Amino acid sequence: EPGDGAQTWARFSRPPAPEAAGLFQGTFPDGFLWAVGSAAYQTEGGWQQHGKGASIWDTFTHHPPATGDVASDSYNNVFRDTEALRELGVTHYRFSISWARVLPNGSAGVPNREGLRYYRRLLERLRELGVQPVVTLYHWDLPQRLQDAYGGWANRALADHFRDYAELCFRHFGGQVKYWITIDNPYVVAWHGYATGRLAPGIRGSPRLGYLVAHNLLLAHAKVWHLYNTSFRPTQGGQVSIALSSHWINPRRMTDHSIKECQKSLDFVLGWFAKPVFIDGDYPESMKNNLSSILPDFTESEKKFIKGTADFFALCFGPTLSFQLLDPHMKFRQLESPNLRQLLSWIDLEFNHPQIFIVENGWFVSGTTKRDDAKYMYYLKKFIMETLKAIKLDGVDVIGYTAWSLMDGFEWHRGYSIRRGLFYVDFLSQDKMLLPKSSALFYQKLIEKNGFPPLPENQPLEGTFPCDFAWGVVDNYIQVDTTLSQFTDLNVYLWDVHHSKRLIKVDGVVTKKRKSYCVDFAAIQPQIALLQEMHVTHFRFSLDWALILPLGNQSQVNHTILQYYRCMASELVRVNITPVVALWQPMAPNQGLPRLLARQGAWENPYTALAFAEYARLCFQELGHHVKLWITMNEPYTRNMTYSAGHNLLKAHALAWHVYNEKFRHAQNGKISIALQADWIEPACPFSQKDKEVAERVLEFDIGWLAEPIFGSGDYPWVMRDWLNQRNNFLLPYFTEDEKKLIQGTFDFLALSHYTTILVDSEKEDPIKYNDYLEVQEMTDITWLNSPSQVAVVPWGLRKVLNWLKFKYGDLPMYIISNGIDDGLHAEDDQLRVYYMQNYINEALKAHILDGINLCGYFAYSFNDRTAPRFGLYRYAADQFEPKASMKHYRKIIDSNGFPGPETLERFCPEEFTVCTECSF
Template sequence: MAPSAPPPLLLLPLLLGRPLLGAPGQGSGTWSRFSRLPYPQDQLFLHDTFPDGFLWGAGSSAYQTEGGWRQGGKGASVWDTFAHHPVTPPGSPATGPTGGDVASDSYNNLFRDAEGLRLLGVSHYRFSLSWSRLLPNGTEPLNPAGLDHYRRLLGRLRELGIEPVVTLYHWDLPQGLQDAFGGWASPILPQLFRDYAELCFRHFGGQVRYWVTMDNPYVVAWHGYGTGRLPPGVQGGPRLGYRAAHHLLQAHAKVWHLYNDHFRPTQKGKVSIALSSHWIKPQRMTEKNIKECQKSLDFVLGWFAKPIFIDGDYPESMRSNLSSLLPEFSEVEKKYIKGTADFFALSFGATLSFQLLDSHMKFQQLESISLRQLLYWISREYNNPQIFIVENSWFVSGSTKRDDAKYIYYLKKFIMETLKAIRYDGVNVFGYTVWSLLDGFEWHRGYSIRRGLFYVDFQSHDKKLVPKSSVLFYQKLIEKNGFPPLPENQPIEGIFPCGFAWGIVDNYIQVDTTPAQFLDSNVYVWDVHQTKKLIKVDGVFTSKRKRHCVDFAAIRLQISLLQEMHITHFHFSLKWSLILPLGNLSLINHTLVHYYQCFASELLRVNITPVVALWQPMAENQELPASLAKYGAWENPETIQAFVDYAKFCFTSLGDRIKFWITMNEPPVKNLTYTAGHNLLKAHAKVWHLYDKEFRRSQKGKISIALQADWVEPACPFSRNDQEVADRILEFDVGWLAEPIFGNGDYPQMMRAWLRRRNSADLYNFHLPYFSEDEKKLIQGSSDFFALSHYTTTLVGWEKEDALKYDHYLEAQMINDITWLHSPSRAAVVPWGLRKLLKWVKSKYGNVPVYVMANGIDDDQNMVHDKLRVYYIQNYINEALK
């Protein structure tokens, strides 16, 4: 008998990992392919390592970091001229440096930068040569000081065992060439660029294995000669922009052939061009929108990539849309340009890929930061080339100094997506370069953002490099060659203890108190022929019978659904505002009370234990009776006694059926004043003691308060400051109400110390009340178990990055790890957060019994199968088992 075929799911990773050959236009299948990948599995973080020999590096460019613009005989570049133009109206106050005159001063700190590279442990360093430092006028004579500078840099890299990746031209064209010939608008520039490259190959080629002719010609052509946004600032419109690009492509091809014919045999290096791209996704998955996405990539990346990697000519979509605006290559030129790259050098990041992308080149589609999909598209569109990511990262605010958490999580996402492209998609990526080694001048953004791994104080004299948290992140990543699987990331197999409670929560059960027909004494006739309605027969009555729980049809349906789940417990909340509409016992909704009695009885009948909360703050009035909400709610001390009276009524009416009580379910600490929280704690304690003294002996139940307790993690795991913020948030979010009950009867000392500090600085005037000694004794220990609700995990840091997500009161910046799964409402799915929370509760409050009263996530309402919720439940339960 033939062996059975293995399950298709087991074959999927192998099929996805095979190298796939492509051809022009085949990249258009990328969008549909990724839309069909299994969800959420395909979006999970990949714990794996990169192939052996993978290149890890960092990069910088001359104008952004070197400074020394008038040192050592350097000539002016177009960026020097552009930056020296006034950027503020005359008479405006100075705001610091606005150009690259000094920048990070790498020209005078060569060994400083090399030490940073050594600390990182990188295998390669990408930097650019300053054309105007080597050839001040753009042509001969050679500047000896410039030559010596780069020889010393290459020598130091060789001593450290770091491979140089050298860019000949990174936007800083000598001003002399712009003045004499009009820069890249002139057809003479390709030959002058070849002459410059020959000089570099001759003097440096023995020490360089990877050459990049030029960086991002799209920006140079389009914004340098088309829009004029960047140097040389020529507003020549599209026609001149396309002409400049034409010359840039010719220049690149000349340099590649020069190296191939005269230097490759002896130097054995490789030459390419660094092309930058965005990624784009369709607004809706239609054939028309996918074609527009393909066109968007053609007009930016394909503009240069297709001539070089395919056939020497521009994309068909450009030629058909631009007509005479786009220059033409002769057949000889096409053959000359085709194949002039030994690898695909890719740049992908905020500044180049998105901020400098003209909106009309999106063709009404949506930008996306999916590096993985771009890598796959390149592999399909350009015959699966070897790809070297020569620039990638994001940015942080110019004010960020040490803990650049936002930068770390973007880096983590991009590197993980690169790993997925290699392991899942068969894309041939052999190296990665983070941008940049150190803070510098960020082109059109100036010094308003930072992209360096090392912090530089631009106002200081010595320009010391200060490692940011991202240095430690990248250093450890290089050391491990990726994200190797760790034991704590692996699911475990096992069983929960005997008697473990498995339950479901429904904050408010669907109460339907419509009386059954047998409780109505009237007699009706069905008007079957005309109105189809029941018509009451006047004066005719039947005898009533007693009410039964089965009269509530809604109960039977809910109980049957719960039975199918095989749960042991069901948690729901009572509606205080409906049971006692006036907030006291003068008016009682007996029908609703009977409904709750019946519901609890039916649960017990099918062996499901009811877990009942007395109060669940949901609506705008916090589900308090109107009379209490109107007069201050929990701010009013009288609400304490009203709650005690309400609780006593519930214990009396329902207590024989209820063995687990929750006084208050998820009090809204984010919206409570300190006075309200003070009264709420006293109300809880009074109710606990009421049950303990008057009802526990006969009813034999347990009672507690349920706190919402989401985990808070320091955004930078290496930062003590971030850890302090996380500890502070946990104390304010959970400890505020937990410490008095499960601790010493008083608020956390951290809260009091923090509020004293904030108030003493005249920033706030928040008063955290004090308990009397008797009140402390009343509150301390007023719980039979620790009940908590847990839904997600939040990252926090101390460095202010995004004002919209910054808590000024607690001095906490909320950060998002974009590698995490997120629900439609953007709630993060972080299973290990539950385990960390449970350990935190144990460490602070001892080995108290813990009930996770609520845990779950929203899912796409349009999906038939709630796949995200299934993943969420499985993995959070597994973390609880750990």
């Protein structure tokens, strides 16, 4: 009933659960209709073959040039269409009888038997393959004789002709066809046919003509449905509906004026035909309180005629109406959304829980796109996932899904600039073969799996990480506050105990200064108390090079900051929390450097490498008695640094590593390596070889650029050098033999920083987002859960990048040196952080146990929210630190040493057996 759907934006304003509806999987119901769709003018071709009369699309596209005369040539190619239907595995084929082919001269005249036998041959092929037909009687291809003789749908005398034609179809094909659609998209027929001129006849009359044409469309659909219900539904038992296309709309801001404007938008676009047909025979009163002289009036005989006149709700939610042909005056200053789940809930509420056959759905790609459509495939995946969420999590009665455009064809106002096909059609070819796209293979494997079943590579693992696994947290910006809390006052005072306990200063008498300890630093012990609450084994932090040496060189060593760092380290060892310390990080004002070093080229200068070696020597001298696990560079931005900057950064890493290995390793017995950021790079199409080549290229330009000199062969990776040679980019520097033997082994472990995965595609979808340098379209799966800053939590990419680092560089010790997401609001993004940490630590456990890598640590990103805001495991508000729920869940992961299972007596480690630490040498 009209008004039941206005609770939809309140139903979905609450955030969903990540652990429940974020890796929401499941299969579709049995008897779900997996369909693929087609039109007549879009695909058939043969615009005059075998005496087919002129449609109004053979006048709009012949100078009202990219016409639909020979579009996909499906009038002659019945066999390859049905072979694509068979290899797609689809359950139903929605196609459209064209009016002008089977009735060229009219119903006052004999039918054209060749077009009728084409549809008969197509239907008998569909019967051979066992696919069921869903047939649109009218898919915008009205004949030119009716437009010429009566003015088209502006006359109410075509409703008889549409009753006659459909009768012919009901007589000829109704024994095979059990699903009929009278008029596909009466919105755009009425509104861009006779009110905007953008579509089929191109009238550009007025909105008055559009509402009169919609009036006659509703009357003609009612006449055809009553013809079927009276004279064909007894013997045949099919179902007749009308394919209504809707947009989805969202408030500009969540006030009830905006919400009633959104309901007014959906009543003006979709309720225009779905309130007569499904509710009461008459238009929405939102339109009857708005344009009652422009909107024509229904006789109450025509209100009982056009009531209940569809057997199912047929929904079109694709790029036809949504974001393309939606009239902006019908948006009512709101924001349209491509949300099919909220729209299906709106259909379920507003129109009395109907059985919804989503009868056209998909997105598009460009016309320059061959068989690699990753954007179409991920829009189709998101759309099928939203219908599965509507069936499962909303109780919407979706009975079928139709992926639109089996093959590429005409696109009605967008010519051939747009491709919506599942099967690639070369329009310049002669055979016009249906080559399966990426979306065809995806949709075939999804029909075969009947949805999204739980994959065996995503189910959680039971097991424990080894003993001396490094459970750590990071804080890249430690709070360096060198204010001493005690023993700073050196004057001597007089304590009048009795008449007072006021304190009188003995002027001139100053005692001696006590030796400063690090109970004096008041900012240290709160942080360590929060770290002891976390139960972490390791705490990672960076030094500020611009604070130790504020002039670049050793002339002005600030021993106060260095004493603060040394006492942070030693008070962490005092409470059995091992400090991991980064020498340099780019997460800083000017590249993590002193301002004298930052103002001299700053990493292009090789003196920055020599000064980093000397600064690291100072840090190993001072703090090195307590820190036994060093990070040289803390995740350099490989996407935002020059090849010479990375060259001298590798040289600085090797010089600091050799300083530690020669001068400081035997004294202190610690380890030192570099931390590199290793986000996973996955091909967008899982069976495209070009996307695999592109994924390996982005992996060698991202990770392998700085990892291959250190962990690999000592040179830059051959993918990188070969890609830059073939594009005439000789800016990647060459290592001399001395430099190559200097950098080739400068690691004690692998420290990786992993947050997300990026999908990569070889095809240039649009050149604005395309990366012309690496020749890659970066993209994302939009069924993945995201953070408020839109980074995808996708946990198997941690396991995949650990396997890639083992494949590329060998069985090295690997520390996941940083891993976390961010927050945006009250408490629902820490459900996302609990989900993230649970599943990413489980995938690290999978990579350790099942894949056999030597994983030695996991470090949660951002200790607190004071230093790295919205990333922290400690909320920082009102100058207090409150533990979030991810703190407690991560502490439970630490204390269990992983995910142990039903029986657990798992220590088995005296005098530790595993070798990734400082052994007997």
